[PDB]
Amino acid sequence: VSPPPPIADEPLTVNTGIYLIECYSLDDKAETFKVNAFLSLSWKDRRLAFDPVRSGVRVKTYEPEAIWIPEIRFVNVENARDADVVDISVSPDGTVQYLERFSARVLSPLDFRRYPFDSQTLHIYLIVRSVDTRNIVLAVDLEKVGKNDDVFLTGWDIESFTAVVKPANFALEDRLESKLDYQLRISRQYFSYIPNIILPMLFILFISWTAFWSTSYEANVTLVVSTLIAHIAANILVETNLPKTPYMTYTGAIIFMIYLFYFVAVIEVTVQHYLKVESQPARAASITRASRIAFPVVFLLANIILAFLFF
Amino acid sequence: VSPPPPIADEPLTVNTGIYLIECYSLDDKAETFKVNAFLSLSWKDRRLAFDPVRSGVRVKTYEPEAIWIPEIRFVNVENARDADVVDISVSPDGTVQYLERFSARVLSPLDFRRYPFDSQTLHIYLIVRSVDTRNIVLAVDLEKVGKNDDVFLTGWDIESFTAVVKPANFALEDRLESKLDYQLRISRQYFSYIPNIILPMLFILFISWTAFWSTSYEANVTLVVSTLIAHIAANILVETNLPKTPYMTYTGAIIFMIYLFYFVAVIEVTVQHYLKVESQPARAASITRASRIAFPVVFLLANIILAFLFF
Amino acid sequence: VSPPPPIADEPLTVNTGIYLIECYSLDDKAETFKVNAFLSLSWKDRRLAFDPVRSGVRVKTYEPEAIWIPEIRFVNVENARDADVVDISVSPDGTVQYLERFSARVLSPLDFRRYPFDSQTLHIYLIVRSVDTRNIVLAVDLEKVGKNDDVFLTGWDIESFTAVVKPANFALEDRLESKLDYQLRISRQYFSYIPNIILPMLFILFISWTAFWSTSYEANVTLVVSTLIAHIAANILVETNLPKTPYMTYTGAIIFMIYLFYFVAVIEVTVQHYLKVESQPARAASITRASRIAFPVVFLLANIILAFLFF
Amino acid sequence: VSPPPPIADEPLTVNTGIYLIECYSLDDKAETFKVNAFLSLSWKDRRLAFDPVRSGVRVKTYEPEAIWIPEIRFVNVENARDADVVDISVSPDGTVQYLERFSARVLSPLDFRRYPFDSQTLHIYLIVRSVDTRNIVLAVDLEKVGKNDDVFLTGWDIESFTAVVKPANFALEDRLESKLDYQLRISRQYFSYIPNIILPMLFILFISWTAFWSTSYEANVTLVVSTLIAHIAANILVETNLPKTPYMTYTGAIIFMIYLFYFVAVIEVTVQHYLKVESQPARAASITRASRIAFPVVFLLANIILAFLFF
Amino acid sequence: VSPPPPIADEPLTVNTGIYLIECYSLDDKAETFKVNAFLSLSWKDRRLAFDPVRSGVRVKTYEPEAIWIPEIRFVNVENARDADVVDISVSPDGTVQYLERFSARVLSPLDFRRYPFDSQTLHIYLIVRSVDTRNIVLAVDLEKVGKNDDVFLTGWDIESFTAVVKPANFALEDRLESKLDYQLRISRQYFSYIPNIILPMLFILFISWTAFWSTSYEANVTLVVSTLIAHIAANILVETNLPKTPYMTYTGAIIFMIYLFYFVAVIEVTVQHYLKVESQPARAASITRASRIAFPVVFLLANIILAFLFF
Numbered sequence A, B, C, D, E: 001v002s003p004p005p006p007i008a009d010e011p012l013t014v015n016t017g018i019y020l021i022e023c024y025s026l027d028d029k030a031e032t033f034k035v036n037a038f039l040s041l042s043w044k045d046r047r048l049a050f051d052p053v054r055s056g057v058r059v060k061t062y063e064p065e066a067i068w069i070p071e072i073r074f075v076n077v078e079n080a081r082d083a084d085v086v087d088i089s090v091s092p093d094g095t096v097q098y099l100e101r102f103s104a105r106v107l108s109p110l111d112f113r114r115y116p117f118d119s120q121t122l123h124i125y126l127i128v129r130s131v132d133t134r135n136i137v138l139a140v141d142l143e144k145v146g147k148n149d150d151v152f153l154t155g156w157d158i159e160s161f162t163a164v165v166k167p168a169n170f171a172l173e174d175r176l177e178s179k180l181d182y183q184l185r186i187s188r189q190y191f192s193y194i195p196n197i198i199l200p201m202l203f204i205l206f207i208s209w210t211a212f213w214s215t216s217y218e219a220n221v222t223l224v225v226s227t228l229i230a231h232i233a234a235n236i237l238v239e240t241n242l243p244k245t246p247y248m249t250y251t252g253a254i255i256f257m258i259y260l261f262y263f264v265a266v267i268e269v270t271v272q273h274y275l276k277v278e279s280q281p282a283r284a285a286s287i288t289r290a291s292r293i294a295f296p297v298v299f300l301l302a303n304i305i306l307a308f309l310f311f
């Protein structure tokens, strides 16, 4: 239980693989997700080599305590992973094939710019620290990188689970470190957002524009103010299931824009009533008739502009 | 502590059984449930066999550490199950009888299409990985698959707990794996939904339709807008205790449909008032008289159509 | 570390006792409560017999690992109890006096039918499984069953903590099981419900009935609709701190009934206004005058009927 | 590892001390707080005594496993404390000086009667159970009872941390117990409540009284009903961050009282409008003029009476 | 094992370093944050020294159990840190080089005075307790104090991670304690607050001021009361994601100030209507015309004064 000694000076290559069994709990606010997978490790330890003719056995099995196992860690985990060693198998040349099943909560930031029409790349960073005896370097065994078909992430579509085969080798606290990037590409299922948030929010907005076909100040006040309160409720509901991004999001922009439409509707409703009382309803009539075209046209154009900027 | 060697080449059959003690916390949003149950395992290990005459006993009790025990895992669990070995017994022929009491949090997706009138099938997937020495295969001891009568899942009816006797055998990372499916059939207790959500939601809708017996634009605006806000409250309350499904649900469809009825009520209320001011209340009267029959008839038909599609 | 041998054939009697130290976290929605308590166990194991003359000590102290201890489990726990052995004391005859302090989240269903004026029976089920060597049977040492006086369950009154002395002996997976029932009788402190939910809910209802002393449709609409929205808020607040019962509760029935009173108030307010416009205010006047007596009388009469059904 | 033997028959005195390192998470609803502190224990074990001149060392250091340590427990804790032994020091005469750093969630009930102007006494109960060999009794080393100056309990002022030096000695399950009471006196920082809950709640009430300077039934209805809804929101916000007390609180009384003021305002608004329609506005005028003085005077007196009762 | 003996009487210097790997979960209400990092420790233990010539190795590796390791603790943690020893390396002169990776929940109070435009200093306090044999003293190895570039704290900007090199040496429970202060300077990303809370809150305020261009008491009541309710919603949303500070905050002051503007708007709306009915609309007109300038001017000045006080 010391690292296998080098034949020349070559670094020790630990081949890795992650096969996702379960994928759950994608918290958008926390930018965390829970994972359940197999972690497979392989390396050559010549000290464990044997003759398969005389030994009679093709493969020897070991307990973790018995042999040297490289200390593999995840970079972006909340706490150290919960692992259970499934199997350790040594080949006649000394090739070790370690398999463990684990659970871990991962920290991977999300890009909310195109929400709820966004895609994400979740990351799992494998890392190994070199020892004074020899330098450990990570590799990807593409044959042992995969995902169970049943893997389902609620409200998301799992596109691919790949690994960037070239590790990031760098110095950290005067020792070499080999980092691997496992990428899980997922896209958001936006269907639900349409009948639940998008269309209800557009209807409460259009209801506010019926004030352009009424001369009743008392009714218009109620119309524009009541629907504005519904939009505040909408804004809270949306913003409370999202983190505070230092950048502007698509849904962020739209919600904001709709507040300006309410502010300008209130100004129109006020102007129309002022002119009515000022005994000049002809100006009030032409402003109201204009608003009937202006408001939907400007709304539809502002939206085209916004969608264009964000997509 | 190596797997029992094969007489020929036949795979080792581990007979299983799950007897549910407590069933709780069915989270609809998370699509998870917690289970507390006995796991029983039985397999032949000829090396453990003894003569009852010489040994003076008919059963031999062992500690887990003492003998080979197959590594059984649950597929769809959040974290590895919390288990406590109840007993290990060996018959004279080497028929091992293992029993453990466990608790796990299980991932089992739900079909919200007919919610709150839905039935579900919860799954418990048992899996064993074959070893280099020999191939392990799972079986169901139907005599040891059950549930306590006291088992109660709050707001659900437990219909049955059965096991699909033929395991799913497949290759995973060049080793055989034997998977068993334990199914817990349940159906939702929808009674509470009727006096709490369904009838209150229909009453706030009918209150909106009293606007078809009023000419007061100011009162109508208030009646349709206020009741619309109550429906938004309803929609939030409902949608916050459900996951974001990529498919349309029955409750989803109904809530959505009711938004259209509110939008058309607002349009009618607007049209009637416009015509009043335009000094043609006869047109306004005939449209309002029509709405009194149209709105309930279209509502009741749309509902029959919807129920028909979903059931 | 195997069970003690019988002198004849008699089952091994493990005497039990539970003394409650801290009772807390009664979750009505989950139907769970947390309990911190002493668990005391006593049995005779003649193998541990000693002559204090030789041994010098009159009672021997042991570590759990050192001697055979019966596997006692709780049936209705979420997860296995967190226990810390306080003391294991053996007297010369081999009597083991085991004491441990534990914490556990117990699953005990509640009857919400008379809520908030309900009383409950919480259950703690002790179980022991028989071994092939000899049958273990539970007993209650009434001297060691109790509760600390300081034990306080927030918003509840603790009446009694007793044990059903005769254990439920039954077969389970071809072995005998001895089950004991510890009952904790409690009753809800309903005082807070009166000034916080009951009286505020009756006042918002009576405010709606002031519409029977007004002819202003616009004011009546606002009165009945605004107070109805307050009742929806009330209903949500109440129902979100309760589980979805398949049966009708007292508070459930009352909340429901009050919705009908709002629906009939809206109908009256509509009918009165229609008749006003139809230029027949004498009919409208007599209906409104009737409603002033009808509404409180029917409300008081329906409440008497409801209280009578539920209590 | 047995308790130190008595010279005569005197009970073994374990001197205790708690020094609070960090104090946090005071949950008012749960009536729990999280603590992090040093627990110090000191007793004489003559067996461990050594020659100071002949052993060369003045103080011997031991590992917990090596010597007898009294089993000290907290009464009012959720689960057993998480402890890490800092140091064990044996003096030449056998005085053991044990130190450990621990964290626990303590259950200490609160008196909400004068909330948010209340002061509290948090309790930490230390307990030891006597053994068959000899009786253990607790004592307070006042020199080792304290708190770090940096100790901060958010929204509270820490007044003192003292210990009631005379332990509660009593019998429990036929063995002596020695209980000690550690008291943490704190008083609530009520400043925030004034600009956030108190003044906003009084303004929405005074806004409802502007109805006494209006003859517009439709406006008064809106004024009194709208502000009443704001008070319901207030009441929910307040009551959801407090437990259901079986006694009346000061904030409880005030919130309740304000509901009666709203009920009487609605009655006045109704009476004034009835009289207007009944063509007798002179009676309506005198009732309204009276209400302008009556409402603030009765409000200010009811408050003086309430404050007097509660303080 | 015991601490390394002094050559003269010099205290043992443990050099420390913290290199932040991942920084997450900054709870403003709890004033806690979660940290994942490397802790590096280095001291000289002459007993572990070896001749590299005869040994053949230029360094020696040990298991924690094998050698003396100083008991380093964090002061301001919730619970004791979860640590995993990465590596222990010994140089030929007996210089130990210890590295561990840990995760802990750190308590560090925040200054909410300039929120959401606030910057903070998070603290990590390292402490070691001296022993009777010798005094242990902490030091900072500035070369081993850092942070990964990828370290991201959601909704915050990480400015610097430094250490106050001179430790706080003081007595605690009659033993000397060496305390080190690690400071993490961060500053809040306030962008999101502008389109989500600030601008929506100003628009609902300006909408209430359109009442100064209306004579309709009914429409004014609705305008000022409805927008006031939106401000209450705002106030709750803001205050529920903040702790109850015993001091006034900037956002606290602004929210409060806006309540006074609503109160004075209600008074103006009341005064204007009273004067209208009193048949003196000229006074009402001049008060209303004044309010149109007074309200924005006083609002803009009050804000300049407030910003000036807080910044």
Ligand SMILES: [Cl-]
Pocket: A072, A073, A074, A075, A077, A079, A080, A081
């Ligand atoms: Cl890890």
Ligand SMILES: [Cl-]
Pocket: B072, B073, B074, B077, B079, B080, B081
């Ligand atoms: Cl498992």
Ligand SMILES: [Cl-]
Pocket: B169, B170, B171
């Ligand atoms: Cl296959």
Ligand SMILES: [Cl-]
Pocket: B130, B135, B174, B175, B176
């Ligand atoms: Cl295979």
Ligand SMILES: [Cl-]
Pocket: C072, C073, C074, C077, C079, C080, C081
């Ligand atoms: Cl248990």
Ligand SMILES: [Cl-]
Pocket: D072, D073, D074, D075, D077, D079, D080, D081
């Ligand atoms: Cl404890």
Ligand SMILES: [Cl-]
Pocket: E072, E073, E074, E077, E079, E080, E081
């Ligand atoms: Cl620590």
Ligand code: NA
Pocket: A001, A064, A065, A066, A067, A068, A069
């Ligand atoms: Na190893």
Ligand code: NA
Pocket: B001, B064, B065, B066, B067, B068, B069
């Ligand atoms: Na084994």
Ligand code: NA
Pocket: C001, C064, C065, C066, C067, C068, C069
């Ligand atoms: Na044992």
Ligand code: NA
Pocket: D001, D064, D065, D066, D067, D068, D069
């Ligand atoms: Na000990």
Ligand code: NA
Pocket: A222, B222, C222, D222, E222
């Ligand atoms: Na209104």
Ligand code: NA
Pocket: E001, E064, E065, E066, E067, E068, E069
């Ligand atoms: Na050590």
